[PDB]
Design an enzyme around this catalytic site. Sequence first.
Site, mmCIF file in Angstrom:
data_model
loop_
_atom_site.group_PDB
_atom_site.id
_atom_site.type_symbol
_atom_site.label_atom_id
_atom_site.label_comp_id
_atom_site.label_asym_id
_atom_site.label_seq_id
_atom_site.Cartn_x
_atom_site.Cartn_y
_atom_site.Cartn_z
ATOM 1 N N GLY A 108 -1.499 -3.905 4.704
ATOM 2 C CA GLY A 108 -1.106 -2.948 3.658
ATOM 3 C C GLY A 108 -1.170 -1.474 4.041
ATOM 4 O O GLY A 108 -0.468 -0.675 3.388
ATOM 5 N N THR B 150 -4.537 -4.559 1.501
ATOM 6 C CA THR B 150 -4.564 -3.106 1.699
ATOM 7 C C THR B 150 -6.009 -2.649 1.872
ATOM 8 O O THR B 150 -6.683 -2.142 0.986
ATOM 9 C CB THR B 150 -3.888 -2.339 0.552
ATOM 10 O OG1 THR B 150 -2.528 -2.777 0.492
ATOM 11 C CG2 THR B 150 -3.935 -0.856 0.829
ATOM 12 N N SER C 213 4.933 1.388 1.876
ATOM 13 C CA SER C 213 5.820 2.415 1.248
ATOM 14 C C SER C 213 6.689 3.076 2.294
ATOM 15 O O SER C 213 7.856 3.384 1.998
ATOM 16 C CB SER C 213 4.971 3.533 0.647
ATOM 17 O OG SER C 213 3.894 3.007 -0.172
ATOM 18 N N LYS D 74 -1.745 -9.704 0.158
ATOM 19 C CA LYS D 74 -1.383 -8.349 0.595
ATOM 20 C C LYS D 74 -2.785 -7.688 0.713
ATOM 21 O O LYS D 74 -3.535 -7.465 -0.277
ATOM 22 C CB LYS D 74 -0.501 -7.584 -0.429
ATOM 23 C CG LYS D 74 -0.330 -6.149 0.130
ATOM 24 C CD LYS D 74 0.588 -5.189 -0.667
ATOM 25 C CE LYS D 74 0.595 -3.844 0.116
ATOM 26 N NZ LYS D 74 1.106 -2.685 -0.659
ATOM 27 N N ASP E 127 0.071 1.209 6.354
ATOM 28 C CA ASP E 127 1.063 1.382 7.408
ATOM 29 C C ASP E 127 0.544 2.028 8.694
ATOM 30 O O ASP E 127 0.982 1.640 9.782
ATOM 31 C CB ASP E 127 2.194 2.280 6.856
ATOM 32 C CG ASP E 127 2.800 1.775 5.555
ATOM 33 O OD1 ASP E 127 2.312 0.820 4.923
ATOM 34 O OD2 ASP E 127 3.859 2.359 5.136
ATOM 35 N N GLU E 128 -0.398 2.952 8.515
ATOM 36 C CA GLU E 128 -0.952 3.717 9.633
ATOM 37 C C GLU E 128 -1.823 2.889 10.592
ATOM 38 O O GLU E 128 -2.260 3.444 11.615
ATOM 39 C CB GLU E 128 -1.713 4.913 9.111
ATOM 40 C CG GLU E 128 -2.855 4.581 8.081
ATOM 41 C CD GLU E 128 -2.404 4.494 6.609
ATOM 42 O OE1 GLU E 128 -3.277 4.708 5.737
ATOM 43 O OE2 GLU E 128 -1.228 4.260 6.319
ATOM 44 N N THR F 147 3.740 1.702 -5.360
ATOM 45 C CA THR F 147 4.813 2.569 -4.820
ATOM 46 C C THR F 147 5.977 2.690 -5.762
ATOM 47 O O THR F 147 6.697 3.686 -5.730
ATOM 48 C CB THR F 147 5.243 1.996 -3.461
ATOM 49 O OG1 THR F 147 4.130 2.010 -2.562
ATOM 50 C CG2 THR F 147 6.332 2.844 -2.807
ATOM 51 N N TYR G 38 -3.270 -9.356 -4.444
ATOM 52 C CA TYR G 38 -3.194 -8.000 -3.874
ATOM 53 C C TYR G 38 -4.587 -7.352 -3.922
ATOM 54 O O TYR G 38 -5.117 -7.038 -5.008
ATOM 55 C CB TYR G 38 -2.143 -7.264 -4.716
ATOM 56 C CG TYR G 38 -1.850 -5.827 -4.361
ATOM 57 C CD1 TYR G 38 -2.235 -5.299 -3.154
ATOM 58 C CD2 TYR G 38 -1.083 -5.066 -5.231
ATOM 59 C CE1 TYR G 38 -1.842 -4.009 -2.776
ATOM 60 C CE2 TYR G 38 -0.678 -3.768 -4.878
ATOM 61 C CZ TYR G 38 -1.061 -3.280 -3.649
ATOM 62 O OH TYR G 38 -0.585 -2.076 -3.185
#
Lengths: 295, 295, 295, 294
Positions: A188, A166, A207, A164, A190-191, A47, A136
């Site tokens: 990771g 994602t 982000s 993290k 957001d949705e 990001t 990550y």
Amino acid sequence: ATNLRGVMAALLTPFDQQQALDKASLRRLVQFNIQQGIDGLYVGGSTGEAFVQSLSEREQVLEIVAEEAKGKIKLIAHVGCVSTAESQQLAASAKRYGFDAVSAVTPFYYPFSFEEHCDHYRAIIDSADGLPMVVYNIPALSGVKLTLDQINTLVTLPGVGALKQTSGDLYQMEQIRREHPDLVLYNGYDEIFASGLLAGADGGIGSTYNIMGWRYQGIVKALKEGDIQTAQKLQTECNKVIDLLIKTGVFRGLKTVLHYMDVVSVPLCRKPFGPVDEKYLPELKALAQQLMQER
Amino acid sequence: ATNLRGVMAALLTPFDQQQALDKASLRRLVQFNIQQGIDGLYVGGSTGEAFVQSLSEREQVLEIVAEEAKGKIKLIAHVGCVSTAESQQLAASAKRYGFDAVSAVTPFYYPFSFEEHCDHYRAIIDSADGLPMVVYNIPALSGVKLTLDQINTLVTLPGVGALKQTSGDLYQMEQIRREHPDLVLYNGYDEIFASGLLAGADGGIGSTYNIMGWRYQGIVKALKEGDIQTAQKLQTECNKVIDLLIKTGVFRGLKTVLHYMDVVSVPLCRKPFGPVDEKYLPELKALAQQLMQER
Amino acid sequence: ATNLRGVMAALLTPFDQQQALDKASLRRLVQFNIQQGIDGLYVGGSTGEAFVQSLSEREQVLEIVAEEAKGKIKLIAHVGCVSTAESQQLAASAKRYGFDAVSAVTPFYYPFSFEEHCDHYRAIIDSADGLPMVVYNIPALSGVKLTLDQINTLVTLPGVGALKQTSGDLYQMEQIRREHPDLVLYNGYDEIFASGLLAGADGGIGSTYNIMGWRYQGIVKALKEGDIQTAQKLQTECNKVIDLLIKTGVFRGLKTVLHYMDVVSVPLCRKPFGPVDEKYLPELKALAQQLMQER
Amino acid sequence: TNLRGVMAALLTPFDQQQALDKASLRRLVQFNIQQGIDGLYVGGSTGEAFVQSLSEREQVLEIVAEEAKGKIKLIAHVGCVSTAESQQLAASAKRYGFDAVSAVTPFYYPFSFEEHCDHYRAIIDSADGLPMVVYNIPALSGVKLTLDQINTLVTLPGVGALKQTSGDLYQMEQIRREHPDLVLYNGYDEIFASGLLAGADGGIGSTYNIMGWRYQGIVKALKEGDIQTAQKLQTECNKVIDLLIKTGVFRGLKTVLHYMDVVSVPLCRKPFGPVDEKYLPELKALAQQLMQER
């Protein structure tokens, strides 16, 4: 490793019209995040447009963020590069600047063996000189697909203090939590934040937290209080925003909202990212106005 | 004088024991390739470990290679970075050093729209100021999957003179040749070179040409003369070598062969690449001896 | 012809307006293929719409094709189903009808272990009662992705006499030929036939051979004679046809051409395949005329 | 009257010669009813439908209706690659009194999206009024639909629900947001609690045959706002799913059911092989633990 658990924004890197770092807008964005109650910042990751910056440019951002926020909120420096030596230089710098932790994406482009990935983390942990490592995992962008057994080995390396995650695989999220009850595990994507926390994550890095971090803190609180309906409503509202940002381009849409909030002077990302299509400006201006009225 | 068609080695970057550029080994490798009859060198691509080098390090290699080879063989500078601005810096340096052409991998890690990719190539072409651009399609490493219509658009941009096609889809190779009869089309997977020429490629760029480029030139000659059996035998021999190098690690196995051929002083790749497993040294030493007896 | 090597058309199944087998058109198509100089027919595979036919319907087609062609050209019965027992029933029918070999796609939909795949082939081979098995590797449709070591194990199972390789990976084609010099190895993607033969296939099975099998025989002869240019030109013509058929839908486009050639009475495929878009009829009719004139 | 709920994807018990074991099929239907299940999804992947003939699938539909019609909801998965074959099964499901039909996107051959739509419309025609449950299972079918394509399918005339066997919980939320009243079944058991939180309002799953009450417990815990209880139940379901994935899911479930005195012979049809005997102690211990809990 003072408590690394929490909701931490993946910080954006503001640039000027000539694509150079806009220092004043960087400081403004750090203060904006602190003002809004974020628990910490993850700096120099995807990001922050780290992969279109030089090492010296990434250090410059880490140094300025520490000046602005050290001691106020937690700071995690993403120091990962494909090169181990470059990652080590950034990790040594993060230590010099007073960050709380370092993090590194699995090295990408060239395929590496799992042993090679492990040695890369170990070397970076050594250079971090005491700062815990946040592994990550982001298969969609890195192209590195780790098995659960590989993730378990990485998170148990000496010096690793968090993951993290994602990934949208919430079976794997639950499996990681089951194997590591005390692991700091950041959702990771957001949705899926609410679902990710229910599966086992204990916080998140994202982000979109730069413009509506309080909604994610709201979902943590709602789930803690057993208020499922409020958690779902907050996630739904976050997702209406994420649908828009995916249409506009996420980093540039976020920078555009922050520009209408008078935080970011120039909303551009570095080439090859293009500008936001003008057809999306009415929606982005209306979202900025809504978020400013909300909190 | 301007023909980019041919068999061009993807040059490796020799490092010393401290992982810094070994200039004397780089110069020896350029001369070794020229001595084996290679038509040109592709410099600063994947094989040169460009993605674990800084920009200055990439420029240093480009400059030294031009000092050693300009005018003797064709020189293509791979100037691609994720960043358009960094790629533009390397394109202008390639022109100052007198390269014959530039090339750039599709920018990776972050997803970019097709229009963004096209503008990235246009910007680099502007900075190459006259040097033709070789579009570089390598979906396996970049993660960028282009349709045939998209590839057709890219190779028809003003200033594009060739396509390095690192894809094993030989239907697509034939379709590209049928749509662009005059396009310089390099086969990118060495293990299918003969079949790729038959499908429509008119040359190739490959990592293994550093140690046996004369075999690929032999396949070109054999197909030109209608000697299918010799073309197949040469490809089979190349594939016995490629099988081994995939087991050992390709760049490091090639550097190791070159070390036994007294070209490369220290055969290491940069971290996170690890060393060659000692169990493979007997085969690599035997291969170096066989290739020297053949040349 | 005391072996299974050669160019065999993957036979289409003609249906009437009610989507029931059109026996007269099936017999005409078998005879049409024989007249083209085809070496054999592969019956009941993907191209015969086997997976939208019942077991008895597939058996009916096998019986009729043997009536028409047994002793004239080679006949391979594709008996594969997801179920091992159903595949065994068709293998027993193929033996009773006098086919020269059986074949079976790797069972699909449900994931099966490699040992389960091997046992499936062994059971079908038992029911085939002496007829050799043609292992059928088609990852794009089956979703089964075998490694080279697994393909090597399958092709060496007792009773296995050939491999239909519907894979565009020509490195793997050459590796399989290198490991099994005497194996009957059919190239499955028509659009890369020339390159597949150069890589090591020694024949092919394909859907488009029903309308232009002489072209593929022409490519085999051209390569045998070292006439690379003629092989390439023939492959280019085949690919101009394949491009059209992929736009129109392949089985239905092929059936439509055969209708214009007076072989197939009604060119329909079974639902869910829809009809050919009328906008393509002029091009399909022109192609039938072109092919009829070329013969 | 609605189709929302927790529905087990029924297994098909076979005898030693791989033929339908009717008595074990009837016992399994009643065992599911006794677990408090809301309905059964019959003839899907879990029922080994793709290694059964049309007549065999009809036979199972008929027996399950004889046993359960009027007691719990019944959804007949009638999907085949062939539209005509799927239509034959839909007509049988209507004759036997099922509450709905369902069909996996046709697989193996690539079909255009319009062809998929026409396939569902033809099956819905033959189902003669029974609502259609679209079934999206990209991992097994190989068909990858976009959100806009899923929206078009779930709004076709006659469609009443979507079985979403996808672990993409952003897409689960997006479908719920676009269709507030849609019956939306979570298909991957190992993410059930998260799937309901994202927007599903029920689920269909193979493991419901042996611990359906745990899934009903998760539904209740979320409805009552007891997050910890929902999470603890999902964790227990996942410890079982981890084992079943090691043993092979359908055969592991049948083996647990055999230890529960429900299924006489726990075999799946070839090419599925038998359960590795090294796993029997774990499967028997699980059966004992489930019976004790239950």
